[PDB]
Amino acid sequence: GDTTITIVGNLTADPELRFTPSGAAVANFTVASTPRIEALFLRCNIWREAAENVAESLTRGARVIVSGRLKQRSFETTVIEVEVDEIGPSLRYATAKVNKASRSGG
Amino acid sequence: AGDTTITIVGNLTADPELRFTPSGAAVANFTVASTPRIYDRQWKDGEALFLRCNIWREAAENVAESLTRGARVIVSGRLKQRSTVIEVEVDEIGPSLRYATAKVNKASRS
Amino acid sequence: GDTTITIVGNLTADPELRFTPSGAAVANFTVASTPRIEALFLRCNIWREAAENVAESLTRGARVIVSGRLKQRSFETTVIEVEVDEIGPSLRYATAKVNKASRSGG
Amino acid sequence: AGDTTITIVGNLTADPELRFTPSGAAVANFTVASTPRIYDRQWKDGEALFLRCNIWREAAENVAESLTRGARVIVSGRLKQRSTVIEVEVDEIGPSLRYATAKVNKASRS
């Protein structure tokens, strides 16, 4: 089958960044969202430069909009997790100066 | 504040389950098995995830009556952290009309 | 970019079916959904056997759940339309007898 | 009854627009241009669609201030048929952190 998800919440901590043996960047963070009618924490993952952009521009307590797919993996005493497709900061209660980086294809 | 809605397409892995609450409310439980297709390289179709869902009210019974193990369903809902344990609070569920057909009933008789 | 959508509503008319010169089946119908806090009509499209399944099993006034992508096309005096990924009938106010068809790969 | 929510990723095509209502409410208007990728055959990336969106309240101004033509945004919302004409009633919007970076402000000063 398939599964996509969109989440709006606040960062719990700041995006922790780490690089892979291959060189590929992997940001990491967890979005906490409390619906109105609670408390749900979703840990997300991002790759490639978008990983570095996140770690570089976001901080704990930031309101974000996330679209991605679900994922699970085993831990030792399976938990759901989110594969980020694209992430941005909400302008619902904030503003932001945006600086794109040019080089379209790659 | 920020919410979290989700749409899932997968299979049931078992017949639903009618868990009547102590208060007297119907609740159907099932888990949607979904393994996505990943157009890469040429594995091109793998990484199965199992999502535990909880449908409430009237639909808890329509689901327990209509759906069965191996069923391809389309689920709409939200992720709740109540109850490890994040589950899908199903808002709408329906037998996918892909690969299958169905005869629909209604609201008002028998 | 990209865009996915999920709709829950009722059929306005019955799925109209038609075949293509290539032989590919194309069902067609439009879902009317009125949110609670209105009246929005979305015309959908489906292909392959799922098209025939729809026309064969659904009827006007039926509550359905639809996931797909948006699409637009010009008409003469552009309108948004939905490319159905998968459609099923809601069990929120109904029940259904399901008869899968076997032949997994194709 | 049945609702309809949607998530869009695309570009703005122009700077937003502050359309203050007669009542006195802020409203920002823009249209998200989105052309999806379609892994088929080997066109493998085409069919551009343009979605007109309307963001309201406080965010109408934060958007008009923060975003500009050519911007890659992530939009969350619902399709409304008010005003041909189906538009996106934006609930949340944000500059996509893919291909770009951003400096976030907040709620309470200056």
UniProtKB/Swiss-Prot annotation, chains A, C:
Superkingdom, natural source: Bacteria
CC terms in the record's Gene Ontology section: nucleoid
UniProt record, GO biological process: DNA replication
Swiss-Prot/TrEMBL keywords: DNA-binding
A molecular function GO annotation: single-stranded DNA binding
Signal peptide: none
Domain SSB: 1-91
Subunit structure: Homotetramer.
Name used for this protein in its record: Single-stranded DNA-binding protein
UniProt organism field: Mycobacterium tuberculosis (strain CDC 1551 / Oshkosh)
Lineage: Bacteria, Bacillati, Actinomycetota, Actinomycetes, Mycobacteriales
Gene that produces this protein: ssb
Shown residues in whole-protein numbering: 3 to 125 of 164
Curated annotation (Swiss-Prot), chains B, D:
Keyword terms, alphabetized: DNA-binding
Keyword DNA-binding part of the UniProt annotation: yes
Keyword flag DNA-binding: yes
GO CC, alphabetical: nucleoid
Domain SSB span(s) in chain numbering: 1-97
Residue ranges of coiled coil: none
Entry's Gene Ontology BP terms: DNA replication
Single annotated GO MF: single-stranded DNA binding
Subunit architecture: Homotetramer.
Record-given protein name: Single-stranded DNA-binding protein
Gene designation: ssb
Residues of the full protein shown: 2 to 123 of 164
